[PDB]
Structures are given as structure tokens and as C-alpha cells.
């Protein structure tokens, strides 16, 4: 339960799965030149 509607899609991409505390996950997100 995260959304209620999806009207106009421009891009879809399905990929391989990325994934005491045992795991450390580092991510960097950047928006450069689109």
C-alpha cells in the first residue's frame, strides 16, 4: 500500500535485485544532466 493511481508513464525498467545488524548497504543517488 504505497500508491492509489498511475496515470501517465514515461519510463519503466525492471532489473536484478540489489539486496545484530549484519548487512550494510550504501547508495548514492545523483541527478546530473537528466
Amino acid at each position: 500500500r504505497v500508491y492509489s493511481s498511475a496515470n501517465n508513464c514515461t519510463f519503466e525498467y525492471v532489473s536484478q535485485p540489489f539486496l545484530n545488524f549484519k548487512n550494510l548497504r550504501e547508495f548514492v543517488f545523483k541527478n546530473i544532466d537528466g
Binding site: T10, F11, E12, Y13
Partner: protein
């Protein structure tokens, strides 16, 4: 579809091979306006509306 309710399909995130369409003999009209068919297979576009 009917001409009143013409279907629009947005083509994105793939490689468009236009030589397959141009070299077919099954089409009576292949009239291109504003661009030439020879350089379509080289150029790149944001989206294709069919």
C-alpha cells in the same frame, strides 16, 4: 483502431531499426515528412509516437 479513436502507442527505451520497415515491399506509402528515411537508422529521438 478506427480513425476517430486512433490508437497511440508511445515507443521508448529501446533501439529502433527503421531499415526493416523501409526495405519491406508490403507498404504502398512510406512518405516521410521533415526527415529522410536513410538517416533515420542513425539519428536518436526522445520518444516515438505510433
Amino acid at each position: 483502431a478506427s480513425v476517430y479513436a486512433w490508437n497511440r502507442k508511445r515507443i521508448s527505451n529501446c533501439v529502433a531499426d527503421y531499415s526493416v520497415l523501409y526495405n519491406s515491399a508490403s507498404f504502398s506509402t512510406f512518405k516521410c515528412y521533415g526527415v529522410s528515411p536513410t538517416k533515420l537508422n542513425d539519428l536518436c529521438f526522445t520518444n516515438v509516437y505510433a
